[PDB]
Design a protein around this ligand. Structure first.
Ligand SMILES: *CCC(=O)N1CCC(Oc2cc3c(Nc4ccc(Cl)c(Cl)c4F)ncnc3cc2OC)CC1
Length: 303
């Protein structure tokens, strides 16, 4: 596959740490092409080492699959460096993750932005369903902001790495997983619909923590009793019904990503009807002037 470039230690450098996580540490890096004088900004993930002791042939086979995604709202793995640590290289998203963006601008986000982010995240998830790829870690933290009008889903496939009976605040995302994933470790595209519902809840609450103050070891207990995340103040009932249907105990009764795209697109064409934000009348998508300016500088891809 020509979609995964193998890099040398000597052709990239980590210059600043951006953050850590369950999979690894993220560095802003500079890619130095051979024989050139330029320095190209990249993103670098130095992964942990929980990979069930066995790989190299497995580490590369998954990277070939992670580097083959071709969708405007799914991040594509660009390179890999197999040293003492497996270092992954991708395009830099200077705006960061959607969770931190929504927290920092929680009083500057309109319903048109919120509804469009859900459509885009659903479009990105629907791609992986057709490519038969389960994310297993969909969350607002793993949604990157390319531009405020264009978000992308990242940290895919990195499931073949962690694990460990730490599912009993931790590493595995208990409060984002479906019930069958917690009890039986069943990961399907319908369990990703559950994670999508929690990710929508995170966006509508402007970055609030789900089940705040509840031990992760007790989440499966409160779910079996029927408790779910509460209705955010800005959500009409039509939007909250969608979130509740993603969290049904029967995975086959949860909506499909193809259905979530259509419904959220319908709500985006009349955003003030379905989301109630105090004064949501001044927060508008950028004009054709600014969008052309953003795309010419930061977002030249198709959509
Ligand atoms: C939501 C909070 C959070 O989880 N973090 C804070 C901001 C993040 O910093 C940035 C990360 C990236 C990434 N991450 C990434 C994901 C998967 C893989 Cl394989 C690779 Cl190589 C990655 F680099 N990707 C692209 N751009 C950014 C930009 C960031 O800040 C500007 C990290 C943790």
């Amino acid at each position: 596959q020509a979609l995964l470039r193998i890099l040398k230690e000597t052709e990239f450098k980590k210059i600043k740490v951006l953050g850590s996580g369950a999979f690894g540490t993220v560095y802003k890096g500079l890619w130095i092409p051979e024989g050139e004088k330029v320095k190209i900004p990249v993103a670098i993930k130095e992964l942990r080492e929980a990979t069930s002791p066995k790989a190299n042939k497995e580490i590369l086979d998954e990277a070939y699959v992670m580097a083959s995604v071709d969708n405007p709202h799914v991040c594509r793995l660009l390179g890999i460096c197999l040293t003492s640590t497996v270092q992954l290289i991708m395009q830099l998203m200077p705006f960061g993750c959607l969770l931190d963006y929504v927290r920092e601008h929680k009083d500057n986000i309109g319903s048109q932005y919120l509804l469009n982010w859900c459509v885009q995240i659903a479009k990105g998830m629907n791609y992986l369903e057709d490519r038969r790829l389960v994310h297993r870690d969909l969350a607002a933290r793993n949604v990157l902001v390319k531009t405020p009008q264009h978000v992308k889903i990242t940290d895919f496939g990195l499931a073949k790495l962690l694990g460990a009976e730490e599912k009993e605040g931790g590493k595995v995302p208990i409060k984002w997983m479906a019930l069958e994933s917690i009890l039986h470790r069943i990961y399907t595209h319908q369990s990703d619909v559950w994670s999508y519902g929690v990710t929508v809840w995170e966006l509508m609450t402007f970055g609030s923590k789900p089940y705040d103050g509840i031990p992760a070891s007790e989440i499966s207990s409160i779910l079996e009793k029927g408790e779910r995340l509460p209705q955010p103040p800005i959500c009409t009932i039509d939007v909250y019904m969608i979130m509740r249907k993603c969290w049904m105990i029967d995975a086959d009764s949860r909506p499909k990503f193809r259905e979530l795209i259509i419904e959220f697109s319908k709500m985006a064409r009349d955003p003030q009807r379905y989301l109630v934000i105090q004064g949501d009348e001044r927060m508008h998508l950028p004009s054709p002037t600014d969008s052309n300016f953003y795309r010419a500088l930061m977002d030249e891809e198709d959509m």
